[PDB]
Design an enzyme around this catalytic site. Structure first.
Site, PDB file in Angstrom:
ATOM      1  N   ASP A   1       0.890  -1.162   0.000  1.00  0.00           N
ATOM      2  CA  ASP A   1       0.000   0.000   0.000  1.00  0.00           C
ATOM      3  C   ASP A   1       0.916   1.197   0.000  1.00  0.00           C
ATOM      4  O   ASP A   1       1.889   1.236   0.766  1.00  0.00           O
ATOM      5  CB  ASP A   1      -0.966   0.021   1.195  1.00  0.00           C
ATOM      6  CG  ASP A   1      -0.259   0.142   2.533  1.00  0.00           C
ATOM      7  OD1 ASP A   1       0.747  -0.591   2.745  1.00  0.00           O
ATOM      8  OD2 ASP A   1      -0.700   0.937   3.397  1.00  0.00           O
TER       9      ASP A   1
ATOM     10  N   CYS B   1      -8.240  -2.173  -4.604  1.00  0.00           N
ATOM     11  CA  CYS B   1      -7.206  -2.429  -3.641  1.00  0.00           C
ATOM     12  C   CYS B   1      -7.928  -2.235  -2.324  1.00  0.00           C
ATOM     13  O   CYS B   1      -9.031  -2.738  -2.201  1.00  0.00           O
ATOM     14  CB  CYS B   1      -6.023  -1.511  -3.800  1.00  0.00           C
ATOM     15  SG  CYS B   1      -6.541   0.054  -4.155  1.00  0.00           S
TER      16      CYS B   1
ATOM     17  N   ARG C   1      -2.957   2.046  -5.691  1.00  0.00           N
ATOM     18  CA  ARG C   1      -2.518   0.978  -6.569  1.00  0.00           C
ATOM     19  C   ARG C   1      -3.471   0.788  -7.750  1.00  0.00           C
ATOM     20  O   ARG C   1      -3.052   0.431  -8.844  1.00  0.00           O
ATOM     21  CB  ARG C   1      -2.359  -0.306  -5.768  1.00  0.00           C
ATOM     22  CG  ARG C   1      -1.254  -0.213  -4.732  1.00  0.00           C
ATOM     23  CD  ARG C   1      -1.300  -1.374  -3.773  1.00  0.00           C
ATOM     24  NE  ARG C   1      -2.394  -1.186  -2.832  1.00  0.00           N
ATOM     25  CZ  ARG C   1      -2.566  -1.923  -1.743  1.00  0.00           C
ATOM     26  NH1 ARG C   1      -1.714  -2.905  -1.475  1.00  0.00           N
ATOM     27  NH2 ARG C   1      -3.552  -1.641  -0.904  1.00  0.00           N
TER      28      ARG C   1
ATOM     29  N   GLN D   1      -1.600   7.497  -5.130  1.00  0.00           N
ATOM     30  CA  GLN D   1      -1.322   8.066  -3.820  1.00  0.00           C
ATOM     31  C   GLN D   1       0.041   8.618  -3.500  1.00  0.00           C
ATOM     32  O   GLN D   1       0.170   9.373  -2.546  1.00  0.00           O
ATOM     33  CB  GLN D   1      -1.719   7.066  -2.734  1.00  0.00           C
ATOM     34  CG  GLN D   1      -3.218   6.932  -2.573  1.00  0.00           C
ATOM     35  CD  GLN D   1      -3.857   8.170  -1.973  1.00  0.00           C
ATOM     36  OE1 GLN D   1      -3.819   8.376  -0.759  1.00  0.00           O
ATOM     37  NE2 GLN D   1      -4.450   9.000  -2.824  1.00  0.00           N
TER      38      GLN D   1
HETATM   39  O1  PIC Z   1      -8.064   6.326   5.518  1.00  0.00           O
HETATM   40  C1  PIC Z   1      -7.748   7.036   4.519  1.00  0.00           C
HETATM   41  O2  PIC Z   1      -8.059   8.251   4.459  1.00  0.00           O
HETATM   42  C2  PIC Z   1      -7.003   6.431   3.330  1.00  0.00           C
HETATM   43  C3  PIC Z   1      -6.659   7.220   2.216  1.00  0.00           C
HETATM   44  C4  PIC Z   1      -5.977   6.709   1.118  1.00  0.00           C
HETATM   45  C5  PIC Z   1      -5.599   5.377   1.125  1.00  0.00           C
HETATM   46  C6  PIC Z   1      -4.905   4.829   0.041  1.00  0.00           C
HETATM   47  C7  PIC Z   1      -4.545   3.467   0.061  1.00  0.00           C
HETATM   48  C8  PIC Z   1      -3.809   2.896  -1.057  1.00  0.00           C
HETATM   49  F1  PIC Z   1      -3.263   3.901  -1.781  1.00  0.00           F
HETATM   50  F2  PIC Z   1      -2.774   2.131  -0.607  1.00  0.00           F
HETATM   51  P1  PIC Z   1      -4.852   1.822  -2.069  1.00  0.00           P
HETATM   52  O3  PIC Z   1      -4.056   1.258  -3.189  1.00  0.00           O
HETATM   53  O4  PIC Z   1      -5.626   0.566  -1.307  1.00  0.00           O
HETATM   54  O5  PIC Z   1      -5.908   2.555  -2.827  1.00  0.00           O
HETATM   55  C9  PIC Z   1      -4.874   2.676   1.182  1.00  0.00           C
HETATM   56  C10 PIC Z   1      -5.565   3.193   2.269  1.00  0.00           C
HETATM   57  C11 PIC Z   1      -5.934   4.550   2.259  1.00  0.00           C
HETATM   58  C12 PIC Z   1      -6.643   5.099   3.344  1.00  0.00           C
END
Ligand code: PIC
Length: 297
Positions: A180, A214, A220, A261
Site C-alpha cells: 500500500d 485495492c 494501486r 497516492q
Molecule cells: O483512511 C484514509 O483516508 C485512506 C486514504 C488513502 C488510502 C490509500 C490506500 C492505497 F493507496 F494504498 P490503495 O491502493 O488501497 O488505494 C490505502 C488506504 C488509504 C486510506
C-alpha cells in the site's frame, strides 16, 4: 514526450513537486450520497468516497450505494470500475455490482491482511468445495480453478444469479506483492501482470467494465488504470509522443478522487508506460522478457 520529461524530472529530482501539483489541479465534486448516515458502514475509509456523478449505483430499490466509481475514459475508449476492498457487510453488494455491470474480470491489487490490519474482506471462495452464497443479493460464487504464481494468482470463478439461475465466468487477478502506498518490484513485474489481464479479454469492450480495486481503491488501482490507459492511447495511434501521462491522470481524477497516492507511484507509472511502449511499438518479444524478469515461476 514522457521519456525526455521523465529524465528531466528525474534529473531535477522534482517528482514530489510534480505530484503535488497534480493534487492541486485534481477535480473536486460532491460525494453527498457517500456521506449519507445510512452509508457510513458501507465505507471503509472516511476520506475516500465516490463522487455522486460517477458512482456505481446498485440496481436495488432499498439502498443503491456502494463505494465504487466508473472511470470512463472517452478518448481511450476503455472504462474501469474502481472500488474499495469490500467490507464484511458489502461483499454481496460487490458481487451484485459485478453482475449488473456485466464485468468479466476483477483485479485485486492488495492482500486481505497488510501491516497487521485487515484491508479487505475474503469476498471470494478459496476452496472449490466451499462456495459462497450472498443471501442479500441472491448470488452464489464458486471457485472453479486457480493458477498460482510467485507474486500473483489468477482464479476462475463462477458467479450465479440464483434469482434467474444465469451463470457467468469471472476471472480474478490477484497481485499479492504490491505494498500500500508502494510500487511493484519492477515495470516488468507489473506489465507481465497487466498483459495477463489484457489477454483474458477482461478489459475488452464486449464485456462490462473490469472491476479494479485495492484497499481504498485509489492508489494501486489508479496506477494500474493510468498505465493501461496510456498504453491504449499510444496503441490506437501507434504514437508514444501523443500521450501526456499527467493529463490522463487528471482526467481519470474527474471520476474518482486520489488516483495514485504517491509521487513514486506516479514515477512508476512513467516507467511502466515507457517500458510497455516497446511492445505497443511492434516488439512483441519484450512480453516474454517481462515474464522472465517477473519471476512468476
Ligand atoms: O483512511 C484514509 O483516508 C485512506 C486514504 C488513502 C488510502 C490509500 C490506500 C492505497 F493507496 F494504498 P490503495 O491502493 O488501497 O488505494 C490505502 C488506504 C488509504 C486510506
Amino acid at each position: 514526450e514522457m521519456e525526455k520529461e521523465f529524465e528531466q524530472i528525474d534529473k531535477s529530482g522534482s517528482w514530489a513537486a510534480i505530484y503535488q501539483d497534480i493534487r492541486h489541479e485534481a477535480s473536486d465534486f460532491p460525494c453527498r450520497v457517500a456521506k449519507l448516515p445510512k452509508n457510513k458502514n458501507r465505507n471503509r475509509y472516511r476520506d475516500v468516497s465516490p463522487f455522486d456523478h460517477s458512482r456505481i449505483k446498485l440496481h436495488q430499490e432499498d439502498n443503491d450505494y456502494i463505494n465504487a466509481s466508473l472511470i470512463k475514459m472517452e478518448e481511450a475508449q476503455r472504462s474501469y470500475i474502481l472500488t474499495q476492498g469490500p467490507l464484511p457487510n458489502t461483499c454481496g453488494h460487490f458481487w451484485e455490482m459485478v453482475w449488473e455491470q456485466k464485468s468479466r474480470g476483477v483485479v485485486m491489487l492488495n492482500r486481505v491482511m497488510e501491516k497487521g490490519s485487515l484491508k479487505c474482506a475474503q469476498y471470494w471462495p478459496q476452496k472449490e468445495e466451499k462456495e459462497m452464497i450472498f443471501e442479500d443479493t441472491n448470488l452464489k460464487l464458486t471457485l472453479i480453478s486457480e493458477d498460482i504464481k510467485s507474486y500473483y494468482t489468477v482464479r476462475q470463478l463462477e458467479l450465479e444469479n440464483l434469482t434467474t439461475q444465469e451463470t457467468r465466468e469471472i476471472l480474478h487477478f490477484h497481485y499479492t506483492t504490491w505494498p500500500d502506498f508502494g510500487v511493484p518490484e519492477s515495470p516488468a513485474s507489473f506489465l507481465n501482470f497487466l498483459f495477463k489481464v489484457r489477454e483474458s479479454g477482461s478489459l475488452s469492450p464486449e464485456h462490462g467494465p473490469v472491476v479494479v480495486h485495492c484497499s481504498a481503491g485509489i492508489g494501486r488501482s489508479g496506477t494500474f488504470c493510468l498505465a493501461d490507459t496510456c498504453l491504449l492511447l499510444m496503441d490506437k495511434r501507434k504514437d508514444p509522443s501523443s500521450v501526456d501521462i499527467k493529463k490522463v491522470l487528471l482526467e481519470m481524477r474527474k471520476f474518482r478522487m486520489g488516483l495514485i497516492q504517491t509521487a513514486d507511484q506516479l514515477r512508476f507509472s512513467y516507467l511502466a508506460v515507457i517500458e510497455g511502449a516497446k511492445f505497443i511499438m511492434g516488439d512483441s518479444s519484450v512480453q516474454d522478457q517481462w515474464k522472465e524478469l517477473s519471476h512468476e515461476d
